[model samples]
Target: CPQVCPAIYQPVFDEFGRMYSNSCEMQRARCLRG
Candidate 1:
């Protein structure tokens, strides 16, 4: 059986520790949480 689950993104902090730096931000803050 194949179970379908919504995609998820975990936050990943870069060397500078900036938010919204990459897909992680979009996925984590937008799609997944939205």
Candidate 2:
């Protein structure tokens, strides 16, 4: 079954950040170059 995941805004390196549905999503974002 599918589920709805809400976005959470968390701070990252040097005051930068992004919205993630969960910790896994946030971690994945960290691996990418922005």
Candidate 3:
């Protein structure tokens, strides 16, 4: 999958770098790590 998809992606920040996806999914992933 592509890194940036403005049509269906919401940019989120983390220790690794910038991630683009659904807000819920991004928040879930962020909670899991830090």
Candidate 4:
């Protein structure tokens, strides 16, 4: 997962939800809503 992130509020989750710059950031993440 080699990519660049930016300052934004886009939520992309197929289960637990969280806010990210884009869906790509969460595409390979261990994330949850916080």
Q: What is the C-alpha lDDT profile of model 2 across 1-34, one tens digit per residue?
A: 1233246654344335544556555556555644
Task: Give every collision pair in model 1.
Answer: none
lDDT of 3 by residue, 1-34 (tens): 2333346666666566766466666656556677
Ranking by TM-score: 2, 3, 4, 1
Where is model 4 more than 4 Å wrong at Cα?
Answer: 15-21, 28-34
C-alpha local distance difference test of each model? 0.48, 0.48, 0.57, 0.55
Best by lDDT: 3
Model 3's alpha-carbon lDDT is: 0.57
lDDT of 4 at 2: 38
lDDT, residue 8, model 3: 62
Candidate 2 Cα errors over 4 Å, as ranges: 1-17
Model 4, TM vs. native: 0.32
Clash count, one per candidate: 0, 0, 0, 0
lDDT of 1 by residue, 1-34 (tens): 1123235645456555666544545445555545
Model 1 CA deviation exceeding 4 Å by range: 1-6, 20-34
| Prediction 2 TM-score vs. true | 0.38
Candidates 1 and 3 compared by TM-score, better number? 3
